[PDB]
Amino acid sequence: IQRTPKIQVYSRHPAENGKSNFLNCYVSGFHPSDIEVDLLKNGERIEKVEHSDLSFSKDWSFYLLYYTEFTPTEKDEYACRVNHVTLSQPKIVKWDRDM
Amino acid sequence: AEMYPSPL
């Protein structure tokens, strides 16, 4: 009777090391609407994170975009960590610039 | 503009 979130992690603009950009975590397809989302840099929670206004799709499921400014590098690892009533443990999705 | 009560 509930729906677990889909999660995509990606950049606003094509990633180029050393160039400022936005890191996005798009959560969608979930129900009910309460959800917790963190963006992580090298495993640690990023503080400045903003989100879009909670919205829903034609199938009634909810969606949100979380985003923060970032400057990608070769070494730094980014991820999105999501919790929802449907998840027993938080789900972590890594940023892969190829996806 | 929104539509201008009828609860369910």
Binding site: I1, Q2, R3, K6, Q8, Y10, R12, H13, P14, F22, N24, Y26, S28, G29, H31, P32, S33, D34, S52, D53, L54, S55, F56, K58, W60, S61, L65, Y67, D98, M99 | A1, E2, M3, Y4, P5, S6, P7, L8
Partner: protein, 274 residues
């Protein structure tokens, strides 16, 4: 092209944690232009697109009052629904509504909508005729009976054919530089070895508006529906959207594959290859 205006209402009960939260957002096509949240410090309808800012104080007052009244109405609806389903006072529940109008390039009504869901399940909907209802179950039949007795559909029809269409036309005019502009996808194909004998070809579409798009892969001119991996179209955060489609291809066979892109902003549909 064609356009839509849609309002989205959500009410969420939270027993032991206050009264149910009520939110509203409004969209023209894929552009959110207004929001309301009963949990806000000072709940008011707020602009979220520059072209709506020019509406005067009377507009904002009316819009805010509608949302404040809705907060109370939806709390009553949630109480009624809990009873209709013999549910305990302890659980949290969600009521959603979407309503609005679709118009063609000439601004004429294509159709109207007024739908509700309870706990994510379709509950009651106004039929396309804008005169009758479809109820999902015996609970919704109670709502249907009340709304038929009160001739609610007639109010919906008047709004959908009148106010809705007229205000959408006004917004499209005020926001013409964005709302009436389709931005085509920027496209490219990338190649990702999986092993010595196969690689992924991924066809990218970036920077497009509106969100509607068709991406497909063909092999030897044959659609690869089952073998194509699609991601959900996703927002970039600058109004535009992104999508990709991928296939796994045998090494050396890449030239047999073509990616096809259709979007409102393209002067012509694109065919791309690695």
């Amino acid at each position: 092209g064609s356009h839509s205006m849609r309002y989205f209402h959500t009410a969420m009960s939270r027993p032991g944690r206050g009264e149910p939260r009520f939110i509203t957002v409004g969209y023209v096509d894929d552009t959110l232009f207004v929001r309301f949240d009963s949990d806000a410090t000072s709940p008011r309808k707020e602009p979220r697109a520059p072209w709506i800012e020019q509406e005067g104080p009377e507009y904002w007052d009316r819009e805010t009052q509608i949302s404040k009244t809705n907060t109370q109405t939806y709390r009553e609806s949630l109480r009624n629904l809990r009873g209709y389903y013999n549910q305990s006072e302890a659980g949290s529940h969600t009521l959603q509504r979407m309503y609005g109008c679709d118009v063609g390039p000439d601004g004429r009504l294509l159709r109207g909508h007024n739908q509700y869901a309870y706990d994510g399940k379709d509950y009651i909907a106004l039929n396309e005729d804008l005169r009758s209802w479809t109820a999902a179950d015996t609970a919704a039949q109670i709502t249907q009976r009340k709304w038929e007795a009160a001739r609610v559909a007639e109010q919906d029809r008047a709004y959908l054919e009148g106010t809705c269409v007229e205000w959408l036309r006004r917004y499209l005019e005020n926001g013409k530089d964005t709302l009436e502009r389709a931005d085509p996808p920027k496209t490219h194909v990338t190649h990702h070895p999986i092993s010595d004998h196969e690689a992924t070809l991924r066809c990218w579409a970036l920077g497009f508006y509106p969100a509607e798009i068709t991406l497909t892969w063909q092999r030897d001119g044959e659609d690869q529906t089952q073998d194509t991996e699609l991601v959900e179209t996703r927002p970039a955060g600058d109004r535009t959207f992104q999508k990709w489609a991928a296939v796994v291809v045998p090494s050396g066979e890449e030239q047999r594959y073509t990616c096809h892109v259709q979007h409102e902003g393209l002067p012509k549909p694109l065919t791309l290859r690695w």
